[PDB]
Write a protein that binds this ligand. Sequence first.
Ligand code: NI
Ligand code: NI
Ligand code: NI
Ligand code: NI
Ligand code: NI
Ligand code: NI
Ligand code: NI
Ligand code: NI
Ligand code: NI
Ligand code: NI
Ligand code: NI
Ligand code: NI
Lengths: 253, 252, 252, 253, 252, 252
Amino acid sequence: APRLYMFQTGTLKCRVCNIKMNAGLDDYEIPVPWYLITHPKGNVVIDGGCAVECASDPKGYWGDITSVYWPVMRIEEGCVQALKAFGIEPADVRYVLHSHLHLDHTGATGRFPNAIHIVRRCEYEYAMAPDWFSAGGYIRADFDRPDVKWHLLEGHDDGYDVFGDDTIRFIFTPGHAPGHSSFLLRLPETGPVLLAVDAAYTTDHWDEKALPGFLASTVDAVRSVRKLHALAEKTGALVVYGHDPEAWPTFRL
Amino acid sequence: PRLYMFQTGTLKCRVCNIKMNAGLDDYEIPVPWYLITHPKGNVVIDGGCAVECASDPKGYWGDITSVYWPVMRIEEGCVQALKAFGIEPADVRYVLHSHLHLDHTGATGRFPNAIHIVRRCEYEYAMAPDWFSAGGYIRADFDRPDVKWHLLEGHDDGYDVFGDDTIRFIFTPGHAPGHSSFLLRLPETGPVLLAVDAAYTTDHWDEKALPGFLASTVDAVRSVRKLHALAEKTGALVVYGHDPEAWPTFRL
Amino acid sequence: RLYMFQTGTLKCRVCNIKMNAGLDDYEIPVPWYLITHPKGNVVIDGGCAVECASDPKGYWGDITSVYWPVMRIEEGCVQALKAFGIEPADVRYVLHSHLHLDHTGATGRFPNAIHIVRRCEYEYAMAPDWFSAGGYIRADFDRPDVKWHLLEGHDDGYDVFGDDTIRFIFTPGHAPGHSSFLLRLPETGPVLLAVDAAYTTDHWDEKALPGFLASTVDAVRSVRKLHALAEKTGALVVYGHDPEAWPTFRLA
Amino acid sequence: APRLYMFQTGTLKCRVCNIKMNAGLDDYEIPVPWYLITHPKGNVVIDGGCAVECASDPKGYWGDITSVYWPVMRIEEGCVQALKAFGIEPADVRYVLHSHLHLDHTGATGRFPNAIHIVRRCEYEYAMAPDWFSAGGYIRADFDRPDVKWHLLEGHDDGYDVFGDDTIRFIFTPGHAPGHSSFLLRLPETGPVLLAVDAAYTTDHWDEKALPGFLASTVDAVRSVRKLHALAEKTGALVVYGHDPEAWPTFRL
Amino acid sequence: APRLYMFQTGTLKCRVCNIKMNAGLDDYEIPVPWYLITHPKGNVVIDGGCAVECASDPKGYWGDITSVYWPVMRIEEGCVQALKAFGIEPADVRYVLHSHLHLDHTGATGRFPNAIHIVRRCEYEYAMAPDWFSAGGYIRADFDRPDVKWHLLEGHDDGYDVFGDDTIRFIFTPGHAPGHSSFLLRLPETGPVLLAVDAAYTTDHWDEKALPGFLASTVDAVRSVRKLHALAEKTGALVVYGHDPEAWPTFR
Amino acid sequence: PRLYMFQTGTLKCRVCNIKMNAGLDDYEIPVPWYLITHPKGNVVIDGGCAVECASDPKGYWGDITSVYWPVMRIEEGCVQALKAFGIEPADVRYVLHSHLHLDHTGATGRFPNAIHIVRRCEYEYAMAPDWFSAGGYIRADFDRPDVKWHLLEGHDDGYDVFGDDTIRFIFTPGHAPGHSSFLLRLPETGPVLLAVDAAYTTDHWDEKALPGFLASTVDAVRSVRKLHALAEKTGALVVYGHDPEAWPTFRL
Ligand code: NI
Ligand code: NI
Ligand code: NI
Ligand code: NI
Ligand code: NI
Ligand code: NI
Ligand code: NI
Ligand code: NI
Ligand code: NI
Ligand code: NI
Ligand code: NI
Ligand code: NI
């Protein structure tokens, strides 16, 4: 029966303003979550965190963006590595799901050779052709790989049900990135779990006391938060914020 | 035709408000507005902050004054300064709006014969804003039943007010959903590119800053590059929106 | 359970309901709906505002020359629910077909209720055109303490509880964000609340066009969309303003 | 030097409500204008009025719709016949412009053997596949002819300049019909002339005291009227309404 | 309990290039599939192959297009006749579904007097007003009949469930034609069956070794195939290609 | 201003790659590119195949060479031919791109001061192509971080490079998503319509052929009829994109 495991590729060191827009220039540190869903029909990885290469050579693999987001992580936190130790070989992953293609969410891409990769077309298309302000958050060595099998979702695909049994559904949440998606999970014992990912970094974002410090569209981002508000109230879901260093320890990790 | 660059005083805020994530230090900006006198009629662009802000900013603007504190004198109100200049309110043919933010709707409905020209989507957004931008829209300024509006559509980019290339709307979405800059052509100066809030300062123009308040980052930076191409094509003189350093260097 | 209420009637002419059909006086019921659900009570629209029972001219304004509301104070949706056994705090959702004046009596009268309507109806209600502005009562729907869920273009079929009990069925045309509702109840089975997508059997049978509408193309295609839905589901079809059909239904 | 000639193919007999929505069932008669532009680069016909077949067999050529719109016209009023009488043979018309493809505006279609027919793509497409409420207003025998050379304009073609010299321009005015276009004309002596056609049936529609009694979108219709308000104010144009039995005799015919 | 019957209206003789783009002028022959679903709630015909008139007088009914696609079929293969030999009379068909409105998929249109015809709106509208390169492929004698009851699906209707029980669902696959739809079926014993129709002529098309030889959009056609890949991989569906002379005998 | 029509040798391919489904015969086409010398600065359009193809085709283009074999000398490289003509690489103000296919990106980035103008949707498609078109996009040409781009938007049709009617973008989608033709106005010659790949040959122009490589057939044929109307209106001299019979009849 299906289960949800919450992992973390270490942390990112940045400023408060990168998380909470115009909030200040103090140092600040955030977890990098990623998720595994074990399912009778196959295992699912969501995003995979920062690329394992960041544990050894961040400046070489990410480049100048490291002056903004410094990744603090060990080699064994790499998604492939963490999974091997957990007992799942890279070949035993049926799906990689992507909320979006930012640099702390593409560690899984191409690392699971049998996995279909599911993401919004417009995220893939923006990733390949970013604007200058966001070009550094997209690592082509992660997501630009000819060997990858992609399922690129269209605008009408909101709610896409990965297995067709309501276990995992994409919940489109544009704004933080053009093709950003959250996920609604339904587990037999826990019930519904809402993975906001970067549609709501922190409880302050969810409560409309902060704007994301990086974003493609503020108009979409705040409407997407309210869309999640309605979804959380309808389902009673447990809400998991994308990058909340105060709430992250309170969940099952 | 002539272009007069007035200013409705200044705004006191933080640096982050103008340059996103750039710090919390105190910062002050001019609030431009513009007069074009034309043989076919006078044109006011935006008109600055409402004159009521000179007396009672908290009463007229409300909570938003905790972010943007307006410093102006009554003399600076756009009706008053134009009255003291020889221009009677009835003697204004057009009011043009870059957008309907609070420091750009001082002229709205104060000129009783003016057709008010703005993008439809700015007008619609102004009437139904999201929570993060609602404070910056003052309904007392733009929500007046008596106003004659021409609401531009998406195909209207480049709209030529007189049909003679003196004043054209240059759509620059991003800072607000219906934000527009303006390209002026004057007999002697030639082309003047009024960036307004598409490019607050030279740092934004040089892609060293993002706006601290914005509807869409994607649109805003693409709109700046649109202006780059227009400036390079025309040789226009580029007037930034709220630049304390560059503003004194213009004929004011 | 579904309970079908009404807030009195409206007095108009036949042509306001069946376009171009005559100036004879005409009277129509104003339905509104209550769904009792184990997970929470649902109010659809709520009829004309209760303020209309006392001071119609004062509350609705000039539009009373077109639509005169005739209702008692006890027909107000709060009052009628209290009489029924349901206090205003015991209402989890208010659903809006659209935001015309005879459909916003419930807005903001239920302090814990999430209000669900198409975003494009909310936005049009805030910035309407001159022909429809009188049909949108800002005193009803423009309350800043109201909690909205504004549905997007892809949310057609939105399932309020997640259990096929109540679904939005987008039916643009009569208003830009008009929605009908498809209900499924255990004993009755499917019930299709057309609301203003089809005022009467004449509209449903394509012998009439609505006497007020934003788009005729959308309005007729929305009726045919309902035709297919009725035919697929076998639903009981409830017309929105039909004086002959309305007494034949079960009323609270 | 270019000139504008305002013709008419008789009248239509209907009810007041067909012209001014919901304004009563009284009997009502309207002129059916069409226009000829003389130009050094060629002759231009706008719409051409009702098909000359309506002067003889209205019920046979139009059908059931004659119970709503009864055409009163003589045979010599057909656009081919009146142009011959005037001095122009059918082969000497270079452009047929269509405001829209309603039955009283397709008398010219395919009657001019060398003319390019210019109309909005979306008007042409809707005319081929209308809805039930408007199917009777589109006469397939007029506009569905395989010999006709069409230039179908797209949405970005607003302002289209037929000759390239500001003499005749399409002014898109959706609402009455999906692809309805008005025309802005500039003549050497008269200056600007605004042909509203069916964007503004009468002065009453222009002053926003009436709505069209037949229309595809009220929202587009009133916004298109206000678009024409702005154009008339900007240019000083003489405004010619499309079916105004009180204002029509006040123009040069 | 529902069943899928796979029929055929003879073949089409054409060139290979008509089926696999730029693959050669060699002669080629392809089956013309069509489908019947028997369902407790009614019988459903999908497309219905070529018109029966093609068995008698091809040139007279199709016109010049018979120079590209020659139909070889017998009058008993006409969809009304082959159903009359199976167990069902024309009046006992509740729904006619259309993948698109090309000549080899409009044999059923208007032949079943009570059948609601379900197709994408944009297919119906394109068929009424096609471009020159494709007009010959649309036979107005088949689909332009005023007696036909149409349900015209909109863009948001992807997934449309005919009966509301997952037996037959429209799977939008634009590209071969603007309004082209494939079908996902679920049968009690067989499980999921994916009718690709003309979104994937052959297994070369499925395997991205061939583009369609006739198409409206190549971009949409290839993205539609990849969308079917994802559907096939998720459901384990049996994939039925639309015009494959080799694989077609492997089916029942 | 003057127009000079150059060519980077030829392409060897099949007939069908040019005229769809028209056969597997050997075929050769010229590869035009254009220079406009203008008082306000020189303009290169496209620039032909990259000069690297004259030395190492298989190395620079890869597998696509099995479809399009390029036959050119180093001297034909756009930078080389311009030097020999008297124009150094620095003396090019603008590089215009019809589209970003391999035979039209020879100039990209070879002129260090040149603003590069192309449709946004072409630049975006080139960066993320589908499998059938990925071969035709050469990253080594257009994916250069140093290049200064002006990316035209959907409303920019008719874009006027110098603002004096000499060179205008004429959007012609279909052969590629963001393909554009160009209408030139020269003082002595009058109008010149560079169709580029919107009309390979006179047979495409005359609607006796479809292009052998295609993003959208619907757009491509409508773009050809758009060019028809433009040529009829202006009397333009019509230059086809890859026509081996017509190309010698023009001034080279
Ligand atoms: Ni992110
Ligand atoms: Ni992140
Ligand atoms: Ni602003
Ligand atoms: Ni400002
Ligand atoms: Ni209503
Ligand atoms: Ni109502
Ligand atoms: Ni009309
Ligand atoms: Ni008319
Ligand atoms: Ni087909
Ligand atoms: Ni077929
Ligand atoms: Ni090409
Ligand atoms: Ni080429």
